[PDB]
Amino acid sequence: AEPRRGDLWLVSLGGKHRPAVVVSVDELLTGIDDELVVVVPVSSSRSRTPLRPPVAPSEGVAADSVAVCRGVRAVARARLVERLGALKPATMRAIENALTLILGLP
Amino acid sequence: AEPRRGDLWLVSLGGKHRPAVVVSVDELLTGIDDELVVVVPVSSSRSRTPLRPPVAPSEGVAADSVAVCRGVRAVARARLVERLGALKPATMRAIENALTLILGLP
């Protein structure tokens, strides 16, 4: 019921709603409305690139989409209004690789 | 653009402002104002924790400030309105470790 890492959720942007992948780890969630969840926005309008790996309707989007890992953002948990689905392990690995590149990590 | 990874910049949050550490890599910068830079906000009102490492006034901020790595977010380059300073390399390593933990990277 609570957002889980790897979940695709609909996010209220304050008002449009757009999907995003939860990328912060499950151990951080205390279950209050005002805690920050780190999400990667998902777009059905941007082209795929190595930093925008594709996301399929099986994973919860309505049309072929990409995860905009350069748009990674912490947002209030209260903005996560509906769970849409869950990503394949390979999609999550591509997202982890993009985020590793973007942030210059080991 | 001019903000470099490891820099402290003042970020206009729309009006509130906060210092933040640039954490995205320099090769992503194409020199357009609306391109996204990933930053970690700095707080002087929260206690230090392993996920909120301290930032020294030597690095450009107020006393007892911490990098709130759970608040990592991409912002438009235009929101970075003043260069404040640069982090010591060990602070950057503490932040990189916190972000690796928060995002479940290898």
């Binding site: 942007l13 304050g14 920050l36 912490a74 947002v75 | 949050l13 729309g14 906000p41 977010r73 438009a76």
Partner: peptide, 10 residues
């Protein structure tokens, strides 16, 4: 688009 989230938790 996502701009309104820029101030969350701060």
């Amino acid at each position: 688009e996502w701009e309104g989230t820029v101030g969350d938790g701060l």
